[PDB]
């Protein structure tokens, strides 16, 4: 075969703060090697519960472009992140295609992300009120007005700020904890494939 290459997977698998729910921070990894056993070694063993490609052959069957994401949510939206189901994060923050090739990875993050006071830096879009096409980002920081009354100001009745916050106090149980999900996705443009694992030809 060949001498292997360092790959920036750990760069999106280890950080002091991931992005919040309002902006799923994209990271277009291209021209790298495929190695995911360190992902298994990082956490105690869980199923990926992931849909596109089976996890026993993510090392082989290699691709042309991996499009990776980095965002932190609740465990109900970990089981609810699947394509076809809607909600509030799955509709108003981040939606998947129906032909979505690629699959998600989740793990618990009580020891890193959660703080005893409760880190309110992680916040989500609850009010966006437009059905979302798959794979685009919307940053509507400005206040919405409802009730057929022109608001256009700061802090009034029926003038709702669209970005409210998670609470991450560590005394809660499984289901309201922070979870860092790294949604890998592959698209096939029929380009020359630069992302592949160890092999000899």
């Amino acid at each position: 075969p060949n001498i292997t290459n360092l790959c920036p997977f750990d760069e999106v698998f280890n950080a002091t703060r991931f992005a919040s729910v309002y902006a799923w921070n994209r990271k277009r990894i291209s021209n790298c090697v495929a190695d995911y056993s360190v992902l298994y070694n990082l956490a105690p063993f869980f199923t990926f519960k992931c849909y596109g490609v089976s996890p026993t052959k993510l090392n082989d069957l290699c691709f042309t472009n991996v499009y990776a994401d980095s965002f932190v949510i609740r465990g109900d939206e970990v089981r609810q992140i699947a394509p076809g189901q809607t909600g509030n994060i799955a509709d108003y923050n981040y939606k998947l295609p129906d032909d979505f090739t690629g699959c998600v990875i989740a793990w618990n993050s009580n020891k890193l992300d959660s703080k005893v006071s409760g880190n309110y830096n992680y916040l989500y879009r609850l009010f966006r009120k437009s059905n979302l096409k798959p794979f685009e980002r919307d940053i509507s920081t400005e206040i919405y007005q409802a009730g057929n009354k022109p608001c256009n100001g700061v802090a009034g009745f029926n003038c709702y700020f669209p970005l409210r916050s998670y609470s991450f106090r560590p005394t809660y149980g499984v289901g309201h904890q922070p979870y860092r999900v790294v949604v890998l996705s592959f698209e096939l443009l029929h380009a020359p494939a630069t992302v592949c694992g160890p092999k000899k030809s």
Partner: antibody
Amino acid sequence: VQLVESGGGLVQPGGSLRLSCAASGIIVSSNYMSWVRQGPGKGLEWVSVIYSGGSTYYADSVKARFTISRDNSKNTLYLQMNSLRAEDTAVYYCAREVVGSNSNMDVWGQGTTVTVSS
Amino acid sequence: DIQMTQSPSSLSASVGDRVTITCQASQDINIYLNWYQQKPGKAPKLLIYDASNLETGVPSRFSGSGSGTDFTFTINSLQPEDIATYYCQQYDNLPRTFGQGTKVEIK
């Protein structure tokens, strides 16, 4: 911002009407509407919630029997029933669901005392 | 489904005194929960936003605190216009479930 009762009368099993609740200027499509039921002598039971994205989430007891959509400009939510088994002799309360995360918004709506009997 | 349960069903004995009303859930939920007060034959009316806040016009002595599947609230003074019911409402974990019913009455 109040809500309007729209319904009544006596209906038979196998027949259904179109329940309606109107608004006083509140948007019904780009908001979060929700209806519940209240039987005589018993507690509330959740009927349906609709989001602004068009996500129809309703209870498993009434699966594939209730259809619900909001009007574009008349500010009235509509729901059509199918194949009523006469257990819903009750009063159906219309609202928007009362809080997103934290607000002083709280308004409820009046509902009509429908009955289903042969 | 979440089993919304309450044991102290009928606190008609308290007249201007301590109320120890509570509700419980089957699975572990956080503070995402509200209670209601439904007048007999009329619409419900809200008192608590998300287990830690209070409604705009109410007496201030209403105070609720609960975390980890046991949720607690008190009415230490029973003014005579509170003669109605009180229901427990879990949300944000579908399906949203209601309590069976709590009854208060003044003698």
